[PDB]
């Protein structure tokens, strides 16, 4: 049964709730982004509206094969009427096609649903700056003060450096980047740009990338592996046994791999900075973990919430245990007492 934090009061709207069959009264099913925990359930056989971004739409049609008529894409930053409700889509600074949704209820309540988001000060000068938000449905993925991590731009720096160094030292070295979903495309696109290459990948990953409205994308990616010295692989495959396996296939064309595992938070964030990172090394293969996050840090979250001054907060992540629920409420209370709302 669909949980209450996936439903929107005073509407026939639900958000990311595609895994429960028909939800009684739901006239519309919103999908915030193309990540499988949020879309679990969609298929070609859906015959209810789905509202999403254009980009999410493309992935819906081309990867899951939903029929064009039931995919209502909407532009961002545009006041849109939907079954006699004003709604707006806002960029979530998560993965490609990810949005937050503003719901403007008939009774006068305003609700923000963040989806998955990485809070940022640029949001504080968006359409949100114009009016009061009574209810916040919040991505609480890293809602605890141990969760710190660097800026995305700091990380892209380190990367552009590690890679460009090695390739200049050894010109027969390959760069490999791990992936398992959309998101974090900046990691491999930036490395390739500094190296003068396209990024090589499987047919299926090329297909996914061609749905994202990246400008100039035809110049940046290829399915011809031989011709490219930045390769994408499954994250499952980014290990010694698997990187050996892959290093065989390339047919004596490279004598060293240099890999990157963009990850979220790990416990080594607590003790080691980004400028002071190292890899595991089993012979000629070297694997970097690098903490490129597409979710809010605790400080980033805190700031956004204290600016918004919501009257109520409804967590959407880590809501499955009473201990997590309790811990989160305590932080919300602190924030509110500090900030005077
Ligand atoms: Ni996500």
From Swiss-Prot:
Cysteine pairings via disulfide bonds: none
- Subunit record text: Binds constitutively to TP53BP1. Binds CDC27, which is itself a component of the anaphase promoting complex (APC). Binds PIAS1.
Q: Which family does it belong to?
A: Belongs to the DNA repair metallo-beta-lactamase (DRMBL) family.
Annotated source species: Homo sapiens (Human)
Q: Tell me the protein's name.
A: DNA cross-link repair 1A protein
Q: What do we know about what induces or represses this protein's expression?
A: During mitosis. The mRNA encoding this protein contains an internal ribosome entry site (IRES) in its 5'-UTR. This 5'-UTR generally suppresses translation while specifically promoting expression during mitosis, when cap-dependent translation may be impaired.
Found, by tissue, as follows: Expressed in brain, heart, kidney, liver, pancreas, placenta and skeletal muscle.
Function field = May be required for DNA interstrand cross-link repair. Also required for checkpoint mediated cell cycle arrest in early prophase in response to mitotic spindle poisons. Possesses beta-lactamase activity, catalyzing the hydrolysis of penicillin G and nitrocefin. Exhibits no activity towards other beta-lactam antibiotic classes including cephalosporins (cefotaxime) and carbapenems (imipenem).
The record's subcellular location field reads: Nucleus
The taxonomy runs: Eukaryota, Metazoa, Chordata, Craniata, Vertebrata
